[PDB]
Nucleic acid binder design. Sequence first.
RNA 1: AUCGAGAGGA
Lengths: 46, 62, 117, 151, 309, 67
Amino acid sequence: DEITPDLWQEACWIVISSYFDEKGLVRQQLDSFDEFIQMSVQRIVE
Amino acid sequence: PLYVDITKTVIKEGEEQLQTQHQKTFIGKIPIMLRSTYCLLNGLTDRDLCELNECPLDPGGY
Amino acid sequence: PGFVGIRFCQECNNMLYPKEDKENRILLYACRNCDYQQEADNSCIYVNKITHEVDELTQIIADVSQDPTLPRTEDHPCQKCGHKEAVFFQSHSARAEDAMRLYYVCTAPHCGHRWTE
Amino acid sequence: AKQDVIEVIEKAHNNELEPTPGNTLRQTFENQVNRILNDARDKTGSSAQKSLSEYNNFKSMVVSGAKGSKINISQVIAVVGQQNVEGKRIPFGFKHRTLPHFIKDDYGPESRGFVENSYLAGLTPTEFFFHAMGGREGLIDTAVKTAETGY
Amino acid sequence: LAIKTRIISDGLKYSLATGNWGDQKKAHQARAGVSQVLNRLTFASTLSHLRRLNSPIGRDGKLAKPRQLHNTLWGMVCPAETPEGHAVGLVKNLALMAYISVGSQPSPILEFLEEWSMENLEEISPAAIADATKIFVNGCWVGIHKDPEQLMNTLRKLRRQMDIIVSEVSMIRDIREREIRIYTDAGRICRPLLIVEKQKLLLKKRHIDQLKEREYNNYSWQDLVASGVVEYIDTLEEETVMLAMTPDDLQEKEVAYCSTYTHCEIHPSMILGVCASIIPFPDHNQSPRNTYQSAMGKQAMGVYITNFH
Amino acid sequence: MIIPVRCFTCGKIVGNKWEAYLGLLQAEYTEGDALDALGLKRYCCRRMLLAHVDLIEKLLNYAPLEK
RNA sequence: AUCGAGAGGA
Ligand SMILES: [Zn+2]
Ligand SMILES: [Zn+2]
Ligand SMILES: [Zn+2]
């Protein structure tokens, strides 16, 4: 049930691999431009 | 190309109003960042990226 | 000596300023907006404590015991309720940067006792 | 050295530390904490120098004067030492915390940036961050002083 | 005929091509350094350029405070990647796991606070503020509360199940002053930290097992965040966060240091960046050498892209 | 990009062992066991095989310019 | 070729 110390070294890197498989590395730029082109332009126009 | 809907209503006198909606009026071309949701490379598999002479490992963001 | 706080007018709710009736020389507090005035009892107008000799326990609040950051100890029990646990920190304020005296706060709820050894 | 620093911290918390003339109580407290840590670092460096043998290449290049120094040997083998920013220890960048991994008002050597390990052993991540701060300060001084010196 | 797309198209193109962020006429008044040509020397250089930050303090400034590596930069900015020359301490690189908020509307949060015991500033008695707690959402004081502990617990609980409060929303309770701060705007840097129970990690073998077959049961990082075992903590929230470096720091010892940890790091090496993670055994090096390698990896020569033909 | 013909240090041929090394890897052999099977006794050649990435396969995905 | 900006090396 609990992550043992001899398995933590693998569990943490599995977690980090999941993070970098889902999010990416340029996610901040991608999401910022999506935010802009999606709601910011409409907010400006309105 | 960005298109904007424009609604123009003429008000002169005597309740002579009429709204003319100029649908999809061109306002300008917005540069599109690569790999974004409005780039042609969004969601494309690595095979399609290679078909379009683009690197699968290219992160975009530019 | 003690400190002096301001007084409010009962008519316009403005502060009473120091004033004096020469006839009786009785410390008066007269509001300078309207004609209202009052007779003082503190007999003190202004104090300036340079030594800032004040107790930090007054400024210490009892809700700080719920901070998961400050350290805790069981070697300084609360005198008010006998609880073993206590949360301690420094004064961490201006004019009190020195005097690393530890200020203890009781962890048990509804007590909140603040003290210093 | 850690036990001695704990003793100073306890004495300060018990108001048993009479300030030296010409200095404030925190000034005296820090000065003596840094004195204890510096004495420990010097002693451990001396121990490393004694442990060095005649075939050691570090010692060879140091005695020849070609490169390196006693402080470099000491930091490689025994103890890197205290990391200092603007002449003092690591400042409380957070609210009374050097890093969020410590507790508030913790003037222990580890919290304020005393790298306990050596380069050969490897530094713990807080020590790595503190050493990065020290190197950044050195780079800042190097990149700043040049214009004034040239003028 | 009345409209002109030329202004929009040409202005956007000019800004992105020259880097002067402003009007074309105010070229000298515009700020440079934005929209630089992408470095394609090597893949590490490209990634570092795409994850680059800067501070508009100016290279001529001789003040050492802005350039100093602040304690706050932990887990957000690489402590080694910085230009050696004039831009030292100003141009920065993102940490590996650092994510910065894209922004949201605080309307659901305000509605929930209204639903709770939060009292509007116009309705509160003026004398009810001394002993109560103040609540700030996106910087504007919206009311007072009398149970800050319960309110903070409830708000964290909502943030941990992808309710009206999204994960990126910041929620800082400062205790010395009774302020409670809720932040939702964009530009806030944050990183994922494992939540810690009474003394135990919330992440478990079930989560790790479901992550092992990440390609079969579509159990991903989004599910990890939804399950309430990982939380994005911004800078200001890190002040009230007690961080366990590793689960080894939660084990009971002969002397109790903290015993009240509220978060844990996924891995200490996440504080590094892109050109700093290439370094083997960086904890056995001197820091200026780490910085030199971080600058020098962008100059390393390899296959900068697969489609170089 | 492609497997070098010779080891840099000693000059022994390693350009005819990449496919066999991959086959051994797919045959559940450990990397060191495969290196021993291919007769790579020296750690220079062991490096030359173990540290090699094969970018020619990725480059072969893109269509040729001339048909 | 001129100006300006950016990235860099010692
Ligand atoms: Zn009055
Ligand atoms: Zn008590
Ligand atoms: Zn060889």
